[PDB]
Design a protein around this nucleic acid. Structure first.
Lengths: 78, 187, 104, 190
RNA sequence: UGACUGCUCCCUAGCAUGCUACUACCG
RNA sequence: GCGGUAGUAGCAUGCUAGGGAGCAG
């Protein structure tokens, strides 16, 4: 149950990243696609988590993009 | 269906015929009463089903319009819905590295490139205040994303190199603070 | 069966449609009036008219589906991503198409 | 539905018969009333049914002819569009080199694959990596298809200008690599 | 930017056929 | 007294047309 959760979270994260016009940079989009496709094919739940950290770092390293703090104060992420 | 004039006429005819028959009478009266009754009965019975079909059709039409309006509304809030959902699942996952980096980004310490996974390759973050430097950087090692990294360079907003010994409590507030640490992943 | 074996010797740029120049109300066109197959040899069309008046609807449909005009009114292209034969590029830019993920 | 030709006769007969009934006359007048009204309603029945059939037939005919007219209009506009496209793409044939290679043919027929190879004015090259780049289009002028081409512009996969001074071995991993090179025919066509 | 086939479920409209019913005409 | 015919209403059956969706090669 800890593996399907991370696969669903990865799908949602890739959708959110695509909504922010990331595919307008070929290298970043290729890396994101590779990570997302690698997570869904995983068999053990440690490689999936490190790839998840790597994929989330892409969204976190975009200043304007989204508001981390507002999205953390809505009874959401801590 | 008791709100139509046809129902009233049929009910009056029914009552009159029933009373006359229960009182007892001849054949011609029964024949005349039934010839005046059956037309009203058919008049009632047609509308009794026409009204039902009209009502169910109206209900279906209102259902369809509600569905169309709701779909049109839903397909116009996707960005916010997806972001809220993503952060809800990120809460539910409950991982230490993800929590660490999310809190770090929430306080101001965000990365500048993709976090590497190998025992090598460079990582660059931004440290905007002395408190974050106190929490993360102590000594010559760096703790980020539930890992260990080794500082090798410090650069300020003026791009001048700052040695590690320089940074201190009262010795810091004369500097361009948005520092940029570049480290490599410790074994 | 014999043509398949014998066609591997000849150059690969001599296969495909054969075009020529026809005139419609004094303006020159470029249309395909035959084919050169690797298996079936040389085939020539049976109803080709060089000089003609203004053309009809089905002639427009036939001339708009022929690759002759599109290839002849385009730029040369040398593509090193693949090893298949390349003919021409129809525009001044190369289009890259991606595939999006699903919805949860 | 209220001014049909038989409506006047039917209504007048009904009114007269019911007035006779309200007069309280004998049973013979009642029998005559019943027969006359029965035949009157019977004759009104087909006059009320056939008209309703005919109106729906006429409406269907009108709808079909309207949709036929719309289809004809769409056909005319698509014909105009196709003609415009053909006559627009005609104007780039380079009618001197094409004529020069057509006349050399022994009967007027030439393969289609050699027309862009010998008459085109512009060349586009797509390069996967640097090793392939340094073997195909190194420098500022290169030779391909027994002709000389000179570079005019270089862009990347994101369609941004790239200068030849930064296409090197060290700087290779910093470019969106599916590079597109544009050149012109030197001394010949453009 | 969205190919060629095959099968199945749901909704509405029309046509044909059948069952029952209500009046009326005819013998 | 029985049958035929003409409209009207409800119900059932099979096709055609339109729309929405699912699976397979």
């Amino acid at each position: 149950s800890k593996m399907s959760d991370v696969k669903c979270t990865s799908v949602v994260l890739l959708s959110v990243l695509q909504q922010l016009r990331v595919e307008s940079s070929s290298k970043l989009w290729a890396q994101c696609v590779q990570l997302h496709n690698d997570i869904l094919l995983a068999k053990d739940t440690t490689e999936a988590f490190e790839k998840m950290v790597s994929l989330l770092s892409v969204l976190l390293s975009m200043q304007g993009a989204v508001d981390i703090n507002k999205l953390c104060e809505e009874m959401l992420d801590n | 269906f008791s709100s139509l004039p046809s129902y009233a006429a049929f009910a009056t005819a029914q009552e009159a015929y029933e009373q006359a028959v229960a009182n007892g009478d001849s054949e011609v009266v029964l024949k005349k009463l039934k010839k005046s009754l059956n037309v009203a009965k058919s008049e009632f019975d047609r509308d009794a089903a026409m009204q039902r079909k009209l009502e169910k059709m109206a209900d279906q039409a209102m259902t369809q319009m509600y569905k169309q309006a709701r779909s049109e509304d839903k397909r116009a809030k996707v960005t916010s819905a997806m972001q809220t959902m993503l952060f809800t699942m990120l809460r539910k996952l409950d991982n230490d590295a993800l929590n660490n980096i999310i809190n770090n980004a929430r306080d101001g310490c965000v990365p500048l490139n993709i976090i590497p996974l190998t025992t090598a390759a460079k990582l660059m973050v931004v440290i905007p205040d002395y408190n974050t430097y106190k929490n993360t950087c102590d000594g010559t090692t760096f703790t980020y994303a539930s890992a260990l990294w080794e500082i090798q360079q410090v650069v300020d907003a003026d791009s001048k190199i700052v040695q590690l010994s320089e940074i201190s409590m009262d010795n810091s507030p004369n500097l361009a603070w948005p520092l940029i640490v570049t480290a490599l992943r410790a074994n | 069966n014999f043509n398949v074996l014998f066609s591997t010797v000849f150059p690969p740029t001599s296969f495909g449609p054969l075009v020529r120049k026809i005139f419609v109300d004094g303006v020159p066109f470029v249309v395909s009036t035959g084919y050169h197959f690797r298996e079936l040899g040389v085939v020539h069309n049976q109803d080709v008219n060089l000089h003609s008046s203004r053309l009809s609807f089905k002639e427009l449909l036939v001339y708009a589906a022929d690759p002759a005009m599109h290839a002849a009114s385009g730029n040369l292209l040398l593509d090193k991503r693949t090893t298949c034969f390349s003919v021409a590029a129809l525009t001044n830019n190369v289009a890259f198409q991606t595939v999006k993920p699903g919805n949860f």
